[PDB]
Amino acid sequence: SGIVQQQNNLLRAIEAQQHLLQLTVWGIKQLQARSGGRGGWMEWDREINNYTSLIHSLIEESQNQQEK
Amino acid sequence: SGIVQQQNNLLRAIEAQQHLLQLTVWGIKQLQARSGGRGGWMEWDREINNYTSLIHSLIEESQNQQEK
Amino acid sequence: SGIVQQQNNLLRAIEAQQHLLQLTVWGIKQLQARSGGRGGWMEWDREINNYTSLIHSLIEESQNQQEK
C-alpha cells in the first residue's frame, strides 16, 4: 500500500497517455492521406507499430506484477 | 526515500510528456484548420479532451499521495 | 525487488513512449514543410526541444538512481 498505490495511478496515467498517443498518431495519418501519399511513409508506421506493441506488452507486465 | 524519489522523477517525466503531448495535439489542430475543416472532427477533440482531463486528474492523485 | 522491478518496466514504458512521441513530432514537422512554412513556427519547436531535453534528463536520473 501507499508506495504501491503510487505505482497504481502511475500506470493508469501512462495507459491513458497511450490512448492520447494513438489518437495523436491517428490524427496524423488522416492529415497524410488527404494530401495524397500512396506510400513512401509506410516504414514510419512500421516504427510506431513496433513501439506500440513494445509498449502494450510492457503495460501487460505491469498489470500482472501489480498482482504481486 | 530512494524508492519514493524514484517515483519522484517518474511523475515529473510523465508531467513533462503531457506538455509535449499537448504541444503535439496543438500542432495537429492548426494543420487541420489550414486545410479547411469546419467540423467533422469535433468528436476527435472530444476524445483528447476527456483523456487530458482523466490524465490531469490522475497526476493530481500522484501529487497528493506523494505527500504521504 | 518486486516494487523496484515495478518501477523497472515503468521507466521502460516511458522511454518507449518518448520514441513514439519523437516519431509523432517528426510526423508533424514534415506535414508542416509540405504546406510551405518558411518559419513562424520555429518557436513551437523551441518548446518541444526544451521539453525533450528536460525529459531526457529526467530519464537519466531514473537510470542512475535505479542503480541504488
Q: CB-CB: which of A17, A32, A66 is closest to C17?
A: A17
Q: What is the rounded distance in angstroms from the CA atom of residue A34 to the CA atom of residue C34?
A: 12
Query: CB–CB of C5/B8 below 8 Å?
Result: no
The 10 Å Cβ neighbour count of residue C54 is: 14
Cell of C68: 541504488
State whether A58 and C3 contact (CB < 8 Å): no
Of the candidates A58, B59, A34, the residue with the CA atom closest to the CA atom of residue C17 = A58
Q: State how far residue A30 is from chain B, nearest Cα, in angstroms.
A: 10
Of the candidates B13, A20, B61, the residue with the CA atom closest to the CA atom of residue C12 = B13
Q: What is the rounded distance in angstroms from the CA atom of residue A58 to the CA atom of residue B1?
A: 25
Q: State how far residue B12 is from chain C, nearest Cα, in angstroms.
A: 8
Of the candidates C37, B58, B27, B40, the residue with the CA atom closest to the CA atom of residue A15 = B58
Q: Does C67 touch chain B (CB under 8 A)?
A: no
Distances (CA, A) of A19 to A56, B51, C63: 11, 8, 26
- Specified resolution (Å): 2.4
Query: In sequence order, which residues have a C-beta less than 8 Å from that of residue B20 and are 6 or more positions away?
Result: C21, C25, C48, C51, C52, C55
Q: Does A63 touch chain C (CB under 8 A)?
A: no
CATH number of residue B36's parent domain: 1.10.287.210
Closest residue in C to B13 (Cα) is: C55
Give the domain extent around B9. 1-68
Query: In sequence order, which residues have a C-beta less than 8 Å from that of residue C16 and are 6 or more positions away?
Result: A51, A54, A55, A58
Which string of DSSP letters, residue by residue, matches A11-35? HHHHHHHHHHHHHHHHHHHHHHHHH
- Total number of domains constituting chain B: 1
